[PDB]
């Protein structure tokens, strides 16, 4: 059974800097594909960030082409991504899954972590 | 007010068996990350408590937890104070580390009047259980202070080495257990004998092969050594050392009864309510654990308990819940300590499987039944060695047990202490 | 809920004179004990400065025997450590518990203080 | 290339309160000024709030001296308007240019953003 | 009773623009002294500005002697500070007293309005 930890902060001033952080286990983390997937209440699904198994391809979207890199840490098991700049539109619940948008995803959605940008 | 051990009149606890929770596991082995992982491997634990002074070792390894190798050997002892509001915990004081690594093997702690003895073993072969016929039979007894003072170089850390040994038929002897106890000025440590196989007497006429058809007579006798064509038998015991003279060293190895005579097997004896009780672990035929209290200090003499619930899991050979004389050497230590007497209540932290080490599960039983169990961990996490201590806090039972189990982002057998509490009110 | 605040510097050149700082809240610090504890990454615990209650007991480690003397403050709750003649051998990040080095430590290991010795 | 995205909407009752803004990026937000500017239908340009880089100065017109008041928040690229006390004259398209009114533009009007105050 | 009400906020980017205010009741305001009063945790008093009752005299001190300029609105009873060109070393707690720097203060210092500029 695989099991998404997802993790992070929330509730912090629009223009900070947050550092969402997911924890996997089970399937093989050495090689594999993780993406940071968002919706807001109302809106469908939003990627954000890709990395790619040995970290050599890393897209991004063009709303958050240049707000957020994600890493990798093949080493120990888990996702960061460290949030910065971010504005009124990026209140949503942050996600980690093995696809990159799609509306695939091959397990289910552990807990996920909400993020809060607002006064 | 002050942490004690168990005197006088504690509260009064739980005397029914409920299935509703009340025992709450304390976590107080708060460890901080372990980024950059790697092989490491910690094993071979030792906790022993007695009048608010506690002392811990270890031996970790880089690589495999069983064939590995020797890089630290942390040995220190500490003070027992509170952490919050009724949260008791262990603050360590001093941290004593041989030089070589790979050379100290089974120690056995004990307490003293302001001082802290551990007695090991050195070998220079590698795990005396393994390889016992090449040991020397030299034995070492580290005295560690449980309040150091400025500048005392004396008074600190003492590296003392035994030189007399009072063995009449034994080979060899060598400390084997958590603590042991002491009266007044009288160390006592758990340890095990080494005999010759071929110098054995023992009738194979007594063995509990009668009620046991699936059972050869012999295997009481194929039992009592680690394998069949050996060359030793282990036999039980405890050591003596009388530190009054200070004049030689004495090294005296007090042989168990013939009672419910097993293999040698990690032994642990301590003061609970005033009377000493006795605990040896089930490496051989008889699966189920072995408890009971001492009426003969110094000739030792364990009326044992007749528990038929609470047992020890194993390889196929020999899994739990076996009565019968088996050829096999193999179990794990799981021990218990007293927390009542008018009703001979006892509390440990046993694993709860057939064939396999996972799960590690508090329970409490007074003779032949549970009363009250709390799972300290998930039921897929893998526990090795467990050491149950209990204490008082300035009005009430509370215990803290050592169990290594399999923390999650960590890849490696850590070994937790919970702080459980005795509960008062049940329902 | 017991919270502590690493504190001090970094970045120094090999030889200098950095001082860490660690305050706490919470338990009584009138009457209790405080270690500095560090890890280099890729290794483990390594104790340096051990102080008691009464400030009648200091102990220190065999590499960092004459190079830092941790003092105490019980009228101000901190914990300071006046490092001098470090090497390159000593970076690492420090953290402050209630323990000398163990592996024991009965509260959350907060946020930690890097110290950097290179160049 | 410079873009400005120009946000908020109309359909408001007579007299009600909306919140115009424009985001850009490209250009350095941290000195340089701002401006809003209207047009109806049928009509020319039309200017109602201004404002200065460090938030010294802040003009605005004779049918709009009360009406709202231009803020400005450098830290996070954006151009707030709190429109309050709007009337059946000021149903408009507005706009964020570098020019208080002018006949001047730096750069290629992009979307704008219609207000429509009737009924 | 005097009743000191200080307002404000923190939390602002290095070099930013603040404007700090404080309101008071009871005594006569339109003659009178008032003087704004910084503390950093680990320091003491320190001052930063100072108005005379007619707003005929303005002190400052060596360190803020070009950076904000206090006022005096006599009508309504306030006292604003329009912090200009901020760094990281003023980040402390300001208040507003009847006495420049001194030791003195005929009145408890009520809540107080702790600035914070940092990253
Ligand atoms: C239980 O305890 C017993 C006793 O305590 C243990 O038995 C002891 O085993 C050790 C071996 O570890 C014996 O020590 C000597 O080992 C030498 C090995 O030399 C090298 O071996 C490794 C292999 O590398 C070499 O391989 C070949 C081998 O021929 C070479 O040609 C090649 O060039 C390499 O050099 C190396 O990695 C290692 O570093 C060594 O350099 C032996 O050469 C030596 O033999 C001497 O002693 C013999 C008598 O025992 C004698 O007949 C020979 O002629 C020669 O003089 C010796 O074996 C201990 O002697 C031995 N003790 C006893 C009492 O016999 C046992 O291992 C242990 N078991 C466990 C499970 O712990
Ligand atoms: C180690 O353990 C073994 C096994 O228990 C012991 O050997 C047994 O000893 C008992 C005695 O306690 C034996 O029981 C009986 O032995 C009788 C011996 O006969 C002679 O006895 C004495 C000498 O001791 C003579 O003076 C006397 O005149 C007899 O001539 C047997 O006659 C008995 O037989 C009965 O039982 C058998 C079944 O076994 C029936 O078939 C018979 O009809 C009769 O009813 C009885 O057996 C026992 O036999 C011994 N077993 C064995 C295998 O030898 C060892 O003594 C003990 N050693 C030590 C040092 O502790
Ligand atoms: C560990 O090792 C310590 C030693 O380091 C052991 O402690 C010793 O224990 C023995 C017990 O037998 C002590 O021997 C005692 O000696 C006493 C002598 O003291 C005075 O005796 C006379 C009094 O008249 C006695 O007459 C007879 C003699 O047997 C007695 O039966 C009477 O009751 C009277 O007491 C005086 O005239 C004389 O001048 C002496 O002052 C003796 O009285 C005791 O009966 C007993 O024999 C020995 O002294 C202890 N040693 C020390 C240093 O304290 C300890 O037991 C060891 N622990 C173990 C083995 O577990
Ligand atoms: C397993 O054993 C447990 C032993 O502690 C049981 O817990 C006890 O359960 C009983 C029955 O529900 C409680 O008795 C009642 O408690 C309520 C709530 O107490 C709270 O009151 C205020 C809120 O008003 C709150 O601030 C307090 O902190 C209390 O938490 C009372 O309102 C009732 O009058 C009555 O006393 C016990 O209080 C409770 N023990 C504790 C320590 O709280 C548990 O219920 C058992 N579970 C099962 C399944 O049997
Ligand atoms: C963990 O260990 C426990 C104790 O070792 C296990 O309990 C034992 O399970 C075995 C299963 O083989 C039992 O052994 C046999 O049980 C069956 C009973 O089933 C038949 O019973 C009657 C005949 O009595 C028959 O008419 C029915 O139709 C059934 O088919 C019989 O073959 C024998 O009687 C034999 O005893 C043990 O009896 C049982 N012990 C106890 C004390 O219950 C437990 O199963 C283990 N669990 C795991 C997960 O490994």
């Known amino acids: 059974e695989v099991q998404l930890v997802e993790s992070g902060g929330g509730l912090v001033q629009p223009g900070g800097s947050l550092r969402l952080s997911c924890?996997?286990?089970?399937?093989?983390?050495?090689?594999?594909?993780?993406?940071?997937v968002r919706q807001a209440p109302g809106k469908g699904l939003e990627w954000?960030?890709?990395?790619?198994?040995?970290?050599?391809?890393?897209?991004?979207?063009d709303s958050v082409k240049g707000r957020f890199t994600i890493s990798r840490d093949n080493s120990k098991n888990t996702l960061y991504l460290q949030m910065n700049s971010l504005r009124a539109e990026d209140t949503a619940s942050?996600?980690?899954?093995?696809?990159?948008?799609?509306?695939?995803?091959?397990?289910?959605?552990?807990?996920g972590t909400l993020v809060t940008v607002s006064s | 007010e002050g942490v004690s051990n168990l005197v006088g009149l504690p509260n009064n606890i739980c005397l029914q068996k409920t299935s509703n929770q009340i025992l709450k596991p304390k976590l107080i082995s708060y460890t901080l990350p372990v980024v950059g992982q790697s092989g490491t491997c910690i094993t071979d634990p030792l906790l022993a408590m007695d009048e608010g002074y506690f002392a811990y070792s270890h031996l970790e390894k880089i690589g495999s937890c069983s064939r590995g190798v020797s890089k630290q050997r942390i040995i220190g002892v500490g003070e027992v104070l509170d952490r919050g509001d009724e949260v008791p915990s262990l603050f360590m004081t001093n941290v004593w580390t041989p030089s070589n690594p790979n050379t100290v093997y089974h120690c056995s702690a004990v307490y003293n009047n302001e001082f802290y003895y551990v007695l090991c073993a050195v070998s220079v072969v590698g795990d005396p259980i393994l390889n016992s016929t090449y040991w020397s039979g030299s034995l070492m007894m580290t005295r560690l202070a449980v309040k150091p003072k400025n500048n005392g170089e004396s008074y600190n850390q003492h590296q003392f080495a035994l030189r007399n040994i009072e063995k009449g038929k034994y080979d060899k002897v060598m400390p084997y257990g958590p603590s042991g106890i002491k009266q007044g000025d009288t160390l006592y440590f758990p340890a095990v004998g080494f005999l010759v196989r071929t110098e054995f007497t023992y009738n194979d006429s007594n063995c509990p092969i009668a009620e046991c058809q699936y059972s050869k007579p012999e295997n009481c006798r194929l039992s009592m050594g680690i394998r069949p064509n050996s060359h030793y038998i282990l036999r039980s015991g405890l050591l003596k050392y009388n530190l009054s003279d200070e004049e030689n060293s004495k090294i005296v190895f007090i042989e168990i009864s013939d009672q419910r005579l097993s293999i040698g097997s990690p032994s642990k004896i301590y003061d609970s309510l005033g009377q000493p009780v006795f605990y040896q672990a089930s490496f051989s035929w008889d699966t189920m654990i072995k408890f009971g209290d001492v009426q003969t200090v110094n000739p030792l003499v364990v009326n044992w308990r007749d528990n038929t619930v609470i047992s020890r899991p194993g390889q196929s050979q020999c899994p739990r819940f076996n009565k019968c004389p088996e050829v096999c050497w193999e179990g794990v230590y799981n021990d218990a300590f007293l927390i009542d007497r008018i009703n001979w209540i006892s509390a440990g932290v046993f694993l709860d499987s057939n064939q396999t080490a996972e799960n590690p599960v508090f329970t409490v039983f007074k003779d032949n039944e549970v009363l009250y169990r709390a799972q300290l961990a998930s039921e897929d996490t893998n526990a090795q060695k467990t050491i149950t201590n209990c204490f008082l806090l300035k009005n009430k039972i509370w215990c803290i047990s050592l169990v290594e189990i399999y923390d999650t982002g960590d890849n490696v057998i850590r070994p937790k202490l919970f702080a459980v509490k005795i509960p008062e009110q049940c329902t | 809920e017991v919270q502590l605040v690493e504190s001090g510097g970094g970045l120094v050149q090999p030889g200098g004179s950095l001082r860490l700082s660690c305050?706490?809240?919470?338990?009584?610090?009138?009457?209790?004990?405080?270690?500095?504890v560090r890890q280099a990454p890729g290794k483990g615990l390594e104790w340096?400065?051990?102080?008691?209650?009464?400030?009648?007991?200091?102990?220190?480690?065999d590499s960092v025997k004459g190079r830092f003397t941790i003092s105490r403050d019980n009228s101000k709750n901190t914990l300071y450590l006046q490092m001098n003649s470090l090497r390159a051998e000593d970076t690492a990040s420090?953290?402050?518990?209630?323990?000398?080095?163990?592996?024991?430590?009965?509260?959350?290991?907060?946020?930690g203080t890097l110290v950097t010795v290179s160049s | 290339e410079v873009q400005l995205v120009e946000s908020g909407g109309g359909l408001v009752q007579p007299g009600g309160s909306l919140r115009l803004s424009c985001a850009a990026s490209?250009?350095?937000?941290?000195?340089?000024?701002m401006s809003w500017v209207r047009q109806a239908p049928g009509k020319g340009l039309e200017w109602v709030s201004y404002?200065?880089?460090?938030?010294?100065?802040?003009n605005y017109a004779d049918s709009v001296k009360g009406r709202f008041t231009i803020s400005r928040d450098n830290s996070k690229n954006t151009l707030y308007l709190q429109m309050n006390s709007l009337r059946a004259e000021d149903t408009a398209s507005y706009y964020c240019?570098?020019?208080?009114?002018?006949?001047?533009?730096?750069?290629?009007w992009g979307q704008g953003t219609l207000v429509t105050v009737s009924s | 009773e005097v009743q000191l009400v200080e307002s404000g906020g923190g939390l602002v980017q290095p070099g930013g623009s603040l404007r700090l205010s404080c309101?008071?009741?009871?005594?006569?305001?339109?003659?009178?002294?008032?003087?704004?009063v910084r503390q950093a945790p680990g320091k003491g008093l320190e001052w930063?500005?100072?108005?005379?009752?007619?707003?005929?005299?303005?002190?400052?001190?060596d360190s803020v002697k070009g950076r904000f300029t206090i006022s005096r609105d006599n009508s309504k009873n306030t006292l604003y500070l329009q912090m200009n060109s901020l760094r990281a070393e003023d980040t402390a707690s300001?208040?507003?007293?009847?006495?420049?720097?001194?030791?003195?203060?005929?009145?408890?210092?009520?809540?107080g309005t702790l600035v914070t500029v940092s990253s």
């Open positions: 490209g250009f350095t937000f941290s000195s340089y000024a």
């Open positions: 240019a570098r020019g208080l009114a002018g006949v001047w533009g730096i750069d290629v």
């Open positions: 404002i200065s880089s460090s938030s010294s100065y802040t």
